[PDB]
RNA sequence: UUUACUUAUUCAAUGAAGCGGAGCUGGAAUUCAUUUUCCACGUUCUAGCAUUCAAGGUCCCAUUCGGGGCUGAUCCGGGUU
RNA sequence: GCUUGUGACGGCCCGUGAAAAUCCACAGGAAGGAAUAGUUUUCAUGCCAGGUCGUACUGAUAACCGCAGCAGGUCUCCAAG
RNA sequence: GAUGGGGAAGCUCCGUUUCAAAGGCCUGAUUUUAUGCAGGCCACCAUCGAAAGGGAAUCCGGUUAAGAUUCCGGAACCUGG
């Protein structure tokens, strides 16, 4: 055969991301002395739209503590913040929506977002619209905090990792149908070249493992092994179950 | 520690599967009873949601030079 | 803008060719009232400390 | 006492500035300099004599 | 006077711009400086075998000063003095025709490594000084055992550059006295008594101890707090 | 198998800026005879401002329109974290 | 009326529709300064200079490409009753 | 797409600010007197990439066999000094 499409996507020629209208990378402020010991105050100047991203962005400007200068950071907007608002960041910040606190300074049940996985990587977890992380316990010895992630899984983080109080704006986005191929076109136009999708059963055997034969079919089962060799991984990759997750078809 | 990897991966898959089943139940419960309601009920529920959804400066002295 | 005299690019006021005069008077009132609130804060902090001294 | 501990207000180390000598050769580069490669007779060649 | 007014600044944690401080602890040094400092650190962190760790037991300051006074009394001949000796003895042998007669027996220190290693094993040497800082250490790691086996007084002294200035080079890494004139034999005997009290009599005890396990400041403070908790 | 150590090896960030230990000053403490302990160690109603080795306070000056020190801004270890 | 420029509005988006050179202004208060003067060439008038390369014509049922003076192909502006 | 580095037997490959001692303005002081240090800076790292994107400043009348917002006549403007 020939090289198939999911193999072809890794050389990254026409499959790279479309990043022209994007505002910049959205990450937290760099951890330093002021956030490590006290707090610092900035002000949010504008809330803007970012191309290829469901959640809006916030432009929070702070002061440089070693030079007479201003520093502007790009945050992801939590639901409720507005222009002209003060944002406090650091160890001694108060528990208000929009503030940036370490995870060892929040009580149980607190709703945080844009959470660092390691202390100092400036935001990794719960960054899409409508998502959040729930604090579900602490460990004062061993300096660890237990969290629940948006997928349902549980994780244990160092208490020096930071997070922003609140839920990320833009929720309820997928509750609307698209209704139109043109709407899907204009959606993926600002992300990457991955739409439309031809089915593998509609190709020839040179192009795909599922291609060929009269009466379009997959000849064998579609569950692949985990140790397949990268031209074979087409289907359901390492599935532990199949079915409906609902068992009733109607609720 | 030879059990910790397989046990942590097992617990993580069970927690992910519970979350998946929960979100699927919630989305099917949203999509049905909405696609299965006529224009009358649709307009009524739309109308319902559109309906219900020390001066401090005193401690300061005066005529100060 | 390099070919004209300064009268065409300026208004005779503080922040003259830069701000609005509404934005300017808002800055003036904000500066004065914030500094007076800082004086109020220092006075009441002195009062709490001179109460707790006894 | 110890020796000499300079105070540094910058965390950056730049390359220091040393004395750059001027060039002073032992023999000449060309030993005969050229004449004017574009003088007046080389610039102006001839008039142009047509109707225009 | 009363037109000047005091106004102290709040260098705070969120109040004013910080002043210029001494940040010499946080300089990003060049890589050659970094490799020097970390080479010294890694040499002191590891366990060191006794045959290299017998170095860094050098001589004391007063004994080093007295030893270098004695050795400076026997400085080798320099180039102008050699040339004028050649002139004077050539003029003398032009008339009288005698060699090694106008020039007497010279006394100086001996300084090359092959030469001094051959003055030991013939046992002509009466004092050996070994530098502590030869950069391939394999050139001098055998000299204490050789001096001990052949019965020669030796001392491990600070400075191959100091030995070089003693013997008119930049570095020399060894020095030896073979003969003294007539009046320094008593001072040489007192010096070799003080030298053998420090180096050769302690050899069979020094050759069995390893040495070098030293931690840094933060690890030492951590171990102190852990043992105080213990 | 489990557990320690850090210098090899590995990962991440920065403008290699505030690390580690000991202090001062409070507070709780609460002395079982004391500081064996621990928290704190200048900024939170407001879309303002914050930059000239820093003013002040002491010392020498070469006193000229001035020029250098300490302190303001606790010591120590040079292990960037 | 027609073509075109422009202004104030309005509709649409799970689509919100480039960057850099460059120029100006403001905050700041360094430094210089009026008395026989300093600042102004951001007010007016007067003086001198502005290098290198392209520039004719066709743009198509004969000037381009299809072996051709080939019914094919090949981007755009103006537009009378 | 070089350099600093790192791969490859090698032709060469990666990468574009990187794990590099990566470079300029001027005040100096001014009087071997001309410009060594200056005493404060210095965060950015080469370069190439649009005759439809961005961009300092020109119009009218005449003139040839064939040229013109370029020549001639008149009238302007911009940059630099
Ligand atoms: Mg890309
Ligand atoms: Mg589909
Ligand atoms: Mg087919
Ligand atoms: Mg077929
Ligand atoms: Mg096949
Ligand atoms: Mg098939
Ligand atoms: Mg069948
Ligand atoms: Mg005006
Ligand atoms: Mg048109
Ligand atoms: Mg302007
Ligand atoms: Mg022409
Ligand atoms: Mg033409
Ligand atoms: Mg033409
Ligand atoms: Mg045409
Ligand atoms: Mg035509
Ligand atoms: Mg045609
Ligand atoms: Mg042709
Ligand atoms: Mg044709
Ligand atoms: Mg390349
Ligand atoms: Mg170019
Ligand atoms: Mg162009
Ligand atoms: Mg444009
Ligand atoms: Mg023509
Ligand atoms: Mg003309």
Curated annotation (Swiss-Prot), chain A:
Oligomeric and partner information: Component of the large ribosomal subunit (LSU). Mature yeast ribosomes consist of a small (40S) and a large (60S) subunit. The 40S small subunit contains 1 molecule of ribosomal RNA (18S rRNA) and 33 different proteins (encoded by 57 genes). The large 60S subunit contains 3 rRNA molecules (25S, 5.8S and 5S rRNA) and 46 different proteins (encoded by 81 genes).
GO molecular function: RNA binding; rRNA binding; structural constituent of ribosome
Organism: Saccharomyces cerevisiae (strain ATCC 204508 / S288c) (Baker's yeast)
Family recorded in the similarity comment: Belongs to the universal ribosomal protein uL2 family.
Keywords for this protein: Cytoplasm, Isopeptide bond, Phosphoprotein, Ribonucleoprotein, Ribosomal protein, RNA-binding, rRNA-binding, Ubl conjugation
One of the protein's GO biological processes: maintenance of translational fidelity
Record cross-link Glycyl lysine isopeptide (Lys-Gly) (interchain with G-Cter in ubiquitin), residues: 45, 92, 118, 144
InterPro entries: NA-bd_OB-fold, Rib_uL2_dom2, Ribosomal_uL2, Ribosomal_uL2_C, Ribosomal_uL2_CS, Ribosomal_uL2_dom3, Ribosomal_uL2_RNA-bd_dom, Translation_prot_SH3-like_sf
Protein name per Swiss-Prot or TrEMBL: Large ribosomal subunit protein uL2A
Anything else known: There are 2 genes for uL2 in yeast.
GO cellular component: cytosol; cytosolic large ribosomal subunit
Xref: SUPFAM superfamilies: Nucleic acid-binding proteins, Translation proteins SH3-like domain
Modified sites of kind Phosphoserine: 51, 94, 158-159, 248
Swiss-Prot record, chain B:
Compartments where located: Nucleus, Nucleolus; Nucleus; Cytoplasm
Superkingdom: Eukaryota
Subunit structure: Associates with the pre-60S ribosomal particle and the nucleopore complex.
Role noted for this protein: Pre-ribosomal factor involved in 60S ribosomal protein subunit export from the nucleus.
Sequence similarity: Belongs to the ECM1 family.
Comment field (misc): Present with 2840 molecules/cell in log phase SD medium.
Name by which UniProt lists this protein: Shuttling pre-60S factor ECM1
Organism this protein belongs to: Saccharomyces cerevisiae (strain ATCC 204508 / S288c)
From Swiss-Prot, chain D:
Main location per the UniProt record: cytoplasm
GO biological process, alphabetically ordered: cytoplasmic translation; ribosomal large subunit assembly
Job description of the protein: Component of the ribosome, a large ribonucleoprotein complex responsible for the synthesis of proteins in the cell. The small ribosomal subunit (SSU) binds messenger RNAs (mRNAs) and translates the encoded message by selecting cognate aminoacyl-transfer RNA (tRNA) molecules. The large subunit (LSU) contains the ribosomal catalytic site termed the peptidyl transferase center (PTC), which catalyzes the formation of peptide bonds, thereby polymerizing the amino acids delivered by tRNAs into a polypeptide chain.
Superkingdom of this protein's organism: Eukaryota
Descriptive protein name: Large ribosomal subunit protein uL23
Cross-link Glycyl lysine isopeptide (Lys-Gly) (interchain with G-Cter in SUMO): residue positions: 42
Organism: Saccharomyces cerevisiae (strain ATCC 204508 / S288c) (Baker's yeast)
Entry's family note: Belongs to the universal ribosomal protein uL23 family.
Keyword vocabulary terms for this entry: Cytoplasm, Isopeptide bond, Ribonucleoprotein, Ribosomal protein, RNA-binding, rRNA-binding, Ubl conjugation
GO molecular function: RNA binding; rRNA binding; structural constituent of ribosome
Residues of the full protein shown: 20 to 71 of 142
Cellular location(s): Cytoplasm
Any one GO cellular component localisation term in the record: cytosol
Curated annotation (Swiss-Prot), chain E:
Lineage top rank: taxon: Eukaryota
Molecular function via GO: RNA binding; structural constituent of ribosome
Protein keywords: Cytoplasm, Ribonucleoprotein, Ribosomal protein
Pfam families in UniProt: Ribosomal_L7Ae
GO cellular component: cytosol; cytosolic large ribosomal subunit
Location relative to the cell: Cytoplasm
InterPro entries from the UniProt entry: eL8/uL1-like (IPR050257), Ribosomal_eL30-like_sf (IPR029064), Ribosomal_eL8-like_CS (IPR004037), Ribosomal_eL8/eL30/eS12/Gad45 (IPR004038), Ribosomal_eL8/Nhp2 (IPR018492), Ribosomal_eL8_euk (IPR001921)
Gene Ontology BP, a term: maturation of LSU-rRNA
Disulfide cross-links: none
Keyword field contains Transferase: no
PANTHER family assigned to the protein according to its UniProt record, in alphabetical order: RIBOSOMAL PROTEIN L7AE FAMILY MEMBER (PTHR23105)
Family: Belongs to the eukaryotic ribosomal protein eL8 family.
Subunit record text: Component of the large ribosomal subunit (LSU). Mature yeast ribosomes consist of a small (40S) and a large (60S) subunit. The 40S small subunit contains 1 molecule of ribosomal RNA (18S rRNA) and 33 different proteins (encoded by 57 genes). The large 60S subunit contains 3 rRNA molecules (25S, 5.8S and 5S rRNA) and 46 different proteins (encoded by 81 genes).
Extra information: Present with 238000 molecules/cell in log phase SD medium. There are 2 genes for eL8 in yeast.
The protein's name in its UniProt record: Large ribosomal subunit protein eL8A
Lineage: Eukaryota, Fungi, Dikarya, Ascomycota, Saccharomycotina
